[PDB]
Design an enzyme around this catalytic site. Sequence first.
Site, PDB file in Angstrom:
ATOM      1  N   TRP A  26      -9.471   6.023  -0.807  1.00  0.00           N
ATOM      2  CA  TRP A  26      -9.858   6.802  -1.940  1.00  0.00           C
ATOM      3  C   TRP A  26      -8.816   6.475  -3.018  1.00  0.00           C
ATOM      4  CZ3 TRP A  26      -8.546   9.663   2.677  1.00  0.00           C
ATOM      5  CH2 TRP A  26      -7.242  10.171   2.713  1.00  0.00           C
ATOM      6  N   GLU A  35      -4.989   3.890 -10.686  1.00  0.00           N
ATOM      7  CA  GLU A  35      -5.790   2.686 -10.577  1.00  0.00           C
ATOM      8  C   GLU A  35      -6.906   2.637 -11.615  1.00  0.00           C
ATOM      9  OE1 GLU A  35      -6.367   1.371  -6.324  1.00  0.00           O
ATOM     10  OE2 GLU A  35      -6.073   3.541  -5.931  1.00  0.00           O
ATOM     11  N   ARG A  64      -0.036   4.417   2.860  1.00  0.00           N
ATOM     12  CA  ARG A  64       0.022   4.189   4.312  1.00  0.00           C
ATOM     13  C   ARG A  64       0.392   5.452   5.162  1.00  0.00           C
ATOM     14  NH1 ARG A  64       3.956  -0.799   4.805  1.00  0.00           N
ATOM     15  NH2 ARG A  64       4.563  -0.050   2.680  1.00  0.00           N
ATOM     16  N   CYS A  78       0.864  -1.247   0.000  1.00  0.00           N
ATOM     17  CA  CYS A  78       0.000   0.000   0.000  1.00  0.00           C
ATOM     18  C   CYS A  78       0.858   1.238   0.000  1.00  0.00           C
ATOM     19  CB  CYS A  78      -0.997   0.037   1.210  1.00  0.00           C
ATOM     20  SG  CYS A  78      -2.116   1.457   1.249  1.00  0.00           S
TER      21      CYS A  78
HETATM   22  C1  HEM Z   1      -6.512   6.198   1.757  1.00  0.00           C
HETATM   23  C2  HEM Z   1      -6.224   6.068   0.453  1.00  0.00           C
HETATM   24  C3  HEM Z   1      -5.478   4.894  -0.034  1.00  0.00           C
HETATM   25  C4  HEM Z   1      -4.719   4.910  -1.163  1.00  0.00           C
HETATM   26  C5  HEM Z   1      -4.479   6.084  -2.138  1.00  0.00           C
HETATM   27  C6  HEM Z   1      -4.168   3.599  -1.251  1.00  0.00           C
HETATM   28  C7  HEM Z   1      -3.352   3.209  -2.319  1.00  0.00           C
HETATM   29  C8  HEM Z   1      -3.166   1.863  -2.579  1.00  0.00           C
HETATM   30  C9  HEM Z   1      -2.890   1.367  -3.870  1.00  0.00           C
HETATM   31  C10 HEM Z   1      -2.771   2.189  -5.143  1.00  0.00           C
HETATM   32  C11 HEM Z   1      -2.689   0.030  -3.756  1.00  0.00           C
HETATM   33  C12 HEM Z   1      -2.347  -0.960  -4.888  1.00  0.00           C
HETATM   34  C13 HEM Z   1      -3.700  -1.349  -5.483  1.00  0.00           C
HETATM   35  C14 HEM Z   1      -3.620  -2.131  -6.774  1.00  0.00           C
HETATM   36  O1  HEM Z   1      -2.735  -1.918  -7.627  1.00  0.00           O
HETATM   37  O2  HEM Z   1      -4.482  -3.008  -7.007  1.00  0.00           O
HETATM   38  C15 HEM Z   1      -2.848  -0.318  -2.386  1.00  0.00           C
HETATM   39  C16 HEM Z   1      -2.669  -1.621  -1.907  1.00  0.00           C
HETATM   40  C17 HEM Z   1      -3.235  -1.921  -0.635  1.00  0.00           C
HETATM   41  N1  HEM Z   1      -3.720  -1.014   0.302  1.00  0.00           N
HETATM   42 FE1  HEM Z   1      -4.057   0.821   0.067  1.00  0.00          FE
HETATM   43  N2  HEM Z   1      -4.516   2.820  -0.200  1.00  0.00           N
HETATM   44  C18 HEM Z   1      -5.365   3.516   0.576  1.00  0.00           C
HETATM   45  C19 HEM Z   1      -6.050   3.108   1.734  1.00  0.00           C
HETATM   46  C20 HEM Z   1      -6.016   1.838   2.279  1.00  0.00           C
HETATM   47  C21 HEM Z   1      -6.791   1.419   3.380  1.00  0.00           C
HETATM   48  C22 HEM Z   1      -7.823   2.263   4.179  1.00  0.00           C
HETATM   49  C23 HEM Z   1      -6.407   0.106   3.611  1.00  0.00           C
HETATM   50  C24 HEM Z   1      -6.903  -0.798   4.685  1.00  0.00           C
HETATM   51  C25 HEM Z   1      -7.292  -0.282   5.885  1.00  0.00           C
HETATM   52  C26 HEM Z   1      -5.477  -0.281   2.597  1.00  0.00           C
HETATM   53  C27 HEM Z   1      -4.834  -1.483   2.490  1.00  0.00           C
HETATM   54  C28 HEM Z   1      -4.135  -1.819   1.315  1.00  0.00           C
HETATM   55  C29 HEM Z   1      -3.807  -3.251   1.075  1.00  0.00           C
HETATM   56  C30 HEM Z   1      -4.047  -4.442   2.043  1.00  0.00           C
HETATM   57  C31 HEM Z   1      -3.212  -3.306  -0.127  1.00  0.00           C
HETATM   58  C32 HEM Z   1      -2.615  -4.573  -0.825  1.00  0.00           C
HETATM   59  C33 HEM Z   1      -3.666  -5.261  -1.745  1.00  0.00           C
HETATM   60  C34 HEM Z   1      -3.247  -6.548  -2.428  1.00  0.00           C
HETATM   61  O3  HEM Z   1      -2.205  -7.137  -2.068  1.00  0.00           O
HETATM   62  O4  HEM Z   1      -3.946  -7.063  -3.370  1.00  0.00           O
HETATM   63  N3  HEM Z   1      -5.186   0.815   1.850  1.00  0.00           N
HETATM   64  N4  HEM Z   1      -3.089   0.839  -1.640  1.00  0.00           N
HETATM   65  N1  LIG Z   2      -7.200   3.312  -3.643  1.00  0.00           N
HETATM   66  C1  LIG Z   2      -7.115   2.112  -3.029  1.00  0.00           C
HETATM   67  C2  LIG Z   2      -7.278   2.027  -1.653  1.00  0.00           C
HETATM   68  C3  LIG Z   2      -7.193   0.792  -0.973  1.00  0.00           C
HETATM   69  C4  LIG Z   2      -6.944  -0.330  -1.754  1.00  0.00           C
HETATM   70  C5  LIG Z   2      -6.850  -1.564  -1.131  1.00  0.00           C
HETATM   71  C6  LIG Z   2      -6.597  -2.690  -1.893  1.00  0.00           C
HETATM   72  C7  LIG Z   2      -6.455  -2.631  -3.270  1.00  0.00           C
HETATM   73  C8  LIG Z   2      -6.212  -3.920  -3.995  1.00  0.00           C
HETATM   74  C9  LIG Z   2      -7.434  -4.513  -4.688  1.00  0.00           C
HETATM   75  N2  LIG Z   2      -7.101  -5.100  -5.983  1.00  0.00           N
HETATM   76  C10 LIG Z   2      -6.898  -6.532  -6.162  1.00  0.00           C
HETATM   77  C11 LIG Z   2      -6.651  -6.835  -7.645  1.00  0.00           C
HETATM   78  C12 LIG Z   2      -5.987  -8.184  -7.896  1.00  0.00           C
HETATM   79  C13 LIG Z   2      -4.929  -8.676  -7.098  1.00  0.00           C
HETATM   80  C14 LIG Z   2      -4.349  -9.928  -7.359  1.00  0.00           C
HETATM   81  C15 LIG Z   2      -4.814 -10.701  -8.435  1.00  0.00           C
HETATM   82  C16 LIG Z   2      -5.854 -10.221  -9.255  1.00  0.00           C
HETATM   83  F1  LIG Z   2      -6.320 -10.954 -10.297  1.00  0.00           F
HETATM   84  C17 LIG Z   2      -6.437  -8.966  -8.977  1.00  0.00           C
HETATM   85  C18 LIG Z   2      -6.555  -1.389  -3.912  1.00  0.00           C
HETATM   86  C19 LIG Z   2      -6.801  -0.234  -3.145  1.00  0.00           C
HETATM   87  N3  LIG Z   2      -6.893   0.991  -3.742  1.00  0.00           N
END
Ligand code: HEM
Ligand SMILES: Nc1ccc2ccc(CCNCCc3cccc(F)c3)cc2n1
Lengths: 411, 407
Positions: free
Chosen positions: A280, A285, A111, A108
């Site tokens: 948000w 994305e 963070r 993420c």
């Molecule tokens: C507040 C604005 C936030 C932004 C701009 C943000 C941004 C991102 C982005 C761009 C990704 C990669 C997503 C992708 O390519 O599919 C990500 C991954 C992630 N974020 Fe965030 N995030 C935010 C909030 C949060 C929140 C509130 C949580 C949980 C409380 C969270 C937990 C995660 C997790 C667990 C991943 C990894 C997902 C995976 O492995 O598939 N994020 N974050």
């Molecule tokens: N803007 C944000 C905020 C919080 C988020 C939290 C988590 C994510 C990840 C969700 N995307 C999963 C996509 C995926 C991952 C792995 C294999 C797949 F086929 C598809 C995106 C977020 N974007």
Amino acid sequence: RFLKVKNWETDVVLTDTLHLKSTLETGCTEHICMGSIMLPVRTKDQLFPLAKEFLDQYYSSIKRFGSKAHMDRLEEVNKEIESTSTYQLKDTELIYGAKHAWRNASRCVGRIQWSKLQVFDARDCTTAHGMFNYICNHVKYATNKGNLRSAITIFPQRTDGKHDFRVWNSQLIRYAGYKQPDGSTLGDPANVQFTEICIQQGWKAPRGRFDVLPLLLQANGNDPELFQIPPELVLEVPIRHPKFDWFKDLGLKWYGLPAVSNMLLEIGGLEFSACPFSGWYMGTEIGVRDYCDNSRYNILEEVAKKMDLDMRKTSSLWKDQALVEINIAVLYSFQSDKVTIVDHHSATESFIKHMENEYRCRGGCPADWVWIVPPMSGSITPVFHQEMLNYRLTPSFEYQPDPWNTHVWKG
Amino acid sequence: RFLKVKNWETDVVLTDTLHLKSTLETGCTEHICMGSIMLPTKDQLFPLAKEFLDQYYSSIKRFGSKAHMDRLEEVNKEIESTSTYQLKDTELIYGAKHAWRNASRCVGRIQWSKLQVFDARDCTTAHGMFNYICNHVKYATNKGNLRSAITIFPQRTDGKHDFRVWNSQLIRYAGYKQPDGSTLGDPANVQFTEICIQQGWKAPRGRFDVLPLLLQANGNDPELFQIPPELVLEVPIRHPKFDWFKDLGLKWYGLPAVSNMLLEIGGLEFSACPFSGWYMGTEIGVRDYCDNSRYNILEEVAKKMDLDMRKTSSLWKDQALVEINIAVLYSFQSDKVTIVDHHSATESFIKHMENEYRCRGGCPADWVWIVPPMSGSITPVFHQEMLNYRLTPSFEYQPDPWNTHVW
Ligand code: HEM
Ligand SMILES: Nc1ccc2ccc(CCNCCc3cccc(F)c3)cc2n1
Ligand code: HEM
Ligand SMILES: Nc1ccc2ccc(CCNCCc3cccc(F)c3)cc2n1
Ligand SMILES: C[C@H](O)[C@H](O)[C@H]1CNc2nc(N)[nH]c(=O)c2N1
Ligand SMILES: C[C@H](O)[C@H](O)[C@H]1CNc2nc(N)[nH]c(=O)c2N1
Ligand SMILES: [Zn+2]
């Protein structure tokens, strides 16, 4: 043992010690790196150690380690595990829990915001209708009319693995996909399978290119139930471009609240299989992945045609030009409608500031470079140049199997 | 044991076994992934030599032949006496091509088997090395029609006799600090440039001054040499649409020729082994031109395009970035100098991974380096899972010779 990471743009070097507190495995070995692989009932035996480790960490953070309140809590959790085989988190430990899972989430980039997370405790919920109610409130509070607030709602934890709460949707708001007989896809290709499970469960599909899916909700191990989110709660943005007037005529929109609903939250050995959370959007994305991935809406060609670029040779970089155009439109549209969004330059710069702070105050920041670097313009964002160390801390968010592959049907 | 890699865009799944033949270590442990870290006696030599000849003989399909066991004895004897051994020509060409084949960071390996190997193991002096180097540069340049090549100098013996090219590339622009405080030319090469000036080089102190060669034979102080400018093919950078682009006064050279790596084959170390192929457009337009620590020209261009530079979210950098790269490609193509764009080079590399999976059982690949530094996700490599592991023969980093040498 200490480890250093170097930023190769600034030559700032940072020293990690936090990696020493890590337990879970990475998947790599001394002979192989698995850094780019997309994917990574518990017993009373393995549970007290996990609870103890979590409470030691909670009591340290509130400067009460070794206190009377610390020792009594440990005593009480152990008494509760042996009598009942599981235990219940206090409110405060849950809030701390949920925050640390985000803070620990090494993929993420957002963070910096980890400590502002509104936590809703839905552990008193018993039915799918109750779940729907909790989800509406979350979405209403998170959206806040365009001024987004991060939130997470936490449904009862797993018990025997047979009474699980699950949100069958991958996000709370997502568009339908429909495979046509001629082989084309209408709407979002990523959601075709799930869309089909909604139809079979009795959803009457509108069959357009942007139909918000219904909620498919499983309480206590029971068959899941369909619920439509009230449209007044689904904030959506029409996409236009500040210079190109034909852009609006492509008919594109997106929704404002990104709300992941399919991860598992682990805290002190407890597993919360339904824990929808929302933040948000970073503009890439939607603009890069959702619109331009070949396996998604795939609008690159349609946009390039309308721009009349030279599409005859890839070395014209028409794909690259169309892509920057679409991303400008995405950010322009959100900002004009006053819906919170962050561009990739600003989010990555924040992230490097967050990371330095964490190395100073915490001794480290687990970070997954493959995911942190944005999917356009990578090397002109400061994350490209930052060395990162990836390791797994708890509390954590984890992947889990899709519920339709594991669920026992009642009928 | 046998591992699967999936392409998430197409769902092609490949099974990897080649990794079980990995010898060197990655830097990762199952507690920490180090994927993104830039760099992480008679006794030792015989197993290394044996490993190497074993795969050599099996590649020409004579594993365990009279000839195989013959050579094994022979090198075994030579080590026992001389404490080193010499490669036959054919083993040497095999070793070099395989060091490229195994380079997990290289996106351009579909070409691996068309490598021209020049054996310079009979060289003795810096003037000799110069001569080999010019022959190499002229052969690989080929008046714009570029050909891969590597030239191999004599192998390490005691470590006080090393052959080294002090340049990091055979052709690179100078960098000077100024009274002003900032930098004329290439900041990357500010250090090397002062070793040359502190060596005798009279620098024209321009933005694009081709560095002299600093060559060390047999551990002696290194010596300066100017490359005949007629052997340095350079490209003026213009834009197929913006007329003012030519007035930025940018150029780059045609030949990328990395000269500071160490080639390891069957335990033998070749510390001077300059090799060259041809550019991917993004190396110059994204990294050389637009890195903050490099020529860093993004604002100058954005300005000339009159973009709104007031806030990051107009994506003016992204906009200017694309235009720069369009111009690099255009220029090289207009001047008939071989270049490849990131779309083409990554589509090739996926084709190469496929070939390697079926003919070899795998292909070590380093995602962090293979995905281009712009438009990552619209290239097919972005969606390809890759396993990274270290096979030998290989190219390795080695410390800068100025930190190690004695005058
Ligand atoms: C507040 C604005 C936030 C932004 C701009 C943000 C941004 C991102 C982005 C761009 C990704 C990669 C997503 C992708 O390519 O599919 C990500 C991954 C992630 N974020 Fe965030 N995030 C935010 C909030 C949060 C929140 C509130 C949580 C949980 C409380 C969270 C937990 C995660 C997790 C667990 C991943 C990894 C997902 C995976 O492995 O598939 N994020 N974050
Ligand atoms: N803007 C944000 C905020 C919080 C988020 C939290 C988590 C994510 C990840 C969700 N995307 C999963 C996509 C995926 C991952 C792995 C294999 C797949 F086929 C598809 C995106 C977020 N974007
Ligand atoms: C023929 C055209 C070639 C192309 C288009 C090409 C492409 C590339 C690119 C883009 C990189 C990363 C560059 C960077 O970011 O610094 C690279 C790395 C590399 N390539 Fe190539 N390559 C080519 C030929 C060669 C040849 C001929 C060899 C050796 C015989 C080679 C060996 C390597 C090595 C060792 C690396 C990694 C260096 C490091 O770790 O710093 N490549 N390749
Ligand atoms: N087009 C080509 C062809 C062959 C190549 C062979 C190698 C290379 C990259 C070598 N550069 C090392 C970069 C580096 C590493 C570690 C620290 C630094 F400051 C810089 C690029 C190539 N490009
Ligand atoms: C195969 C590869 O690991 C995979 O496509 C990853 C690459 N990096 C990513 N990075 C982010 N933020 N999101 C993603 O979906 C992916 N996909
Ligand atoms: C920290 C990070 O490992 C470093 O910036 C790498 C990232 N990926 C790269 N990829 C390529 N092709 N070339 C590079 O120089 C780098 N630099
Ligand atoms: Zn790793």
